């Protein structure tokens, strides 16, 4: 893939991808969407699929720009937060990589900070 190779050549894979989306690029494909009972609580990144009927659930590594582009993650001492877990996004979404890159997980309740988190 051309965009993944551009991302891997660049200092900031996230910026490179998001700029590319904004410029008309077509989203990363082949994200691994799981089958689940959609009876989950709806948290963002979970040990097992946790989607509500409002969400899709994805294999974490397949929606991680750094994993997909084969470049080191931002924290070289740590481990990818997505790989080995499952990522819940709105059920329609066609660009799950973008969604993951532009939202933040509340660190106490575990939901996305996009109107699902209720803390503070």
């Amino acid at each position: 893939s051309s965009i993944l190779s551009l991302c891997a050549f660049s200092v900031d894979p996230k910026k490179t991808y998001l700029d590319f989306i904004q410029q008309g690029g077509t989203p990363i494909a082949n994200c691994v969407k799981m089958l689940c009972d959609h009876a989950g609580t709806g948290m963002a990144i979970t040990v097992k699929p946790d989607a509500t009927t409002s969400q899709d659930s994805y294999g974490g590594a397949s929606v991680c720009i750094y994993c997909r582009a084969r470049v080191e993650h931002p924290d070289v001492d740590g481990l990818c937060k997505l790989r080995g877990k499952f990522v819940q996004v709105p059920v329609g979404i066609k660009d799950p990589v973008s969604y993951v890159l532009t939202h933040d997980v509340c660190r106490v309740c575990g939901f996305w900070r996009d109107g699902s988190c209720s803390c503070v």
Partner: protein, 295 residues
């Protein structure tokens, strides 16, 4: 058809007793009349249906289960089967996978290369293979036993699989091995499972449950594969993915399984009945610690 709603089909026992001649497979259903739930990759459906079948067996499922997944990569560089296994297996299960070519996976460790060079020397509780090489098959007029990665699979069963462990090995009409079939005689139970989603394919999963390390039955591998093809030749399935809408019970439950580093001299009558129930795995008990496991 009602049968479209199960995860798939397993070889009827009677076929396992036949002496079928080897013949080409001919399925009645090559038009592939099955739809997949929206946005769903074929191998996600396939692996999910395989795990649905394995949910009905006496799989030994302990804490710190060791699972090896060979042939986990795709041409698109992701690992759909490994994602399903990660969803399926209990939290804290050590899932390690492998493929010839680089790919990105939700396993705790991935090794790129010939499975033969896999650098881990531990004993495993469950080995899944989807390894497959297209049309680089043994040429000739005869469908004969193949020796590729199957040689390695047989070696892992003989030396690197805990007593009580299980395997599920992808085979097709041409991609099969006679010794692997014979080794299924060393398990408490063995079958071939064909997923409903891929019913239009000779693909089957050759499954052994609860390894005993002793031949419980004697299987001529060459005859057995012919028997499997004869079964595919004398049954007609629509195919289907309806079982994928029943996911409430999907996750594999801890089975009530103990791990004991028993000696070969302590494998008595009780041990064996425990092995056949999925209640006991015999191997070293230490937690295998991988660098990439969030511990």
């Amino acid at each position: 058809a009602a049968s479209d709603w199960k995860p798939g089909y397993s070889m009827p026992v009677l076929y396992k007793y036949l002496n079928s001649p080897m013949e080409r497979v001919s399925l009645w259903n090559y038009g592939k009349p099955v739809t997949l739930p929206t946005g769903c990759m074929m191998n996600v459906a396939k692996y999910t249906q395989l795990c649905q079948y394995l949910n009905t067996t006496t799989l030994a499922v302990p804490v710190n289960m060791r699972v090896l997944h060979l042939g986990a990569g795709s041409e698109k560089g992701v690992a759909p089967g490994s994602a399903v296994l990660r969803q399926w297996l209990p939290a804290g299960t050590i899932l390690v996978d492998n493929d010839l070519y680089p790919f990105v996976s939700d396993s705790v460790a991935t090794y790129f290369g010939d499975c033969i060079t896999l650098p881990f020397d531990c004993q495993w509780d469950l080995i899944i293979s989807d390894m497959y090489d297209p049309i680089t098959k043994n040429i000739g007029e005869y469908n004969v036993s193949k020796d590729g990665f199957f040689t390695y699979i047989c070696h892992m069963i003989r030396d690197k699989l805990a007593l009580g462990g299980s395997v599920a090995i992808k085979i097709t009409e041409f991609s099969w091995n006679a010794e692997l079939y014979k080794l299924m005689g060393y398990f408490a139970f063995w079958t071939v499972f064909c997923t409903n989603a891929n019913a239009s394919s000779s693909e089957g999963f050759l499954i052994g449950i609860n390894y005993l390390c002793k031949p419980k039955v004697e299987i001529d591998g060459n005859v057995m594969h012919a028997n499997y093809l004869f079964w595919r030749n004398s049954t007609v399935w629509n195919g289907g993915a309806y079982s994928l809408f029943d996911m409430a019970k999907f996750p594999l439950k801890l089975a009530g399984t103990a791990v004991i580093n028993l000696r070969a001299d302590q494998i008595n009558d009780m041990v064996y009945s425990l092995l056949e129930k999925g209640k006991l795995l015999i191997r070293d008990t230490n937690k295998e610690v991988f660098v990439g496991d969030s511990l």
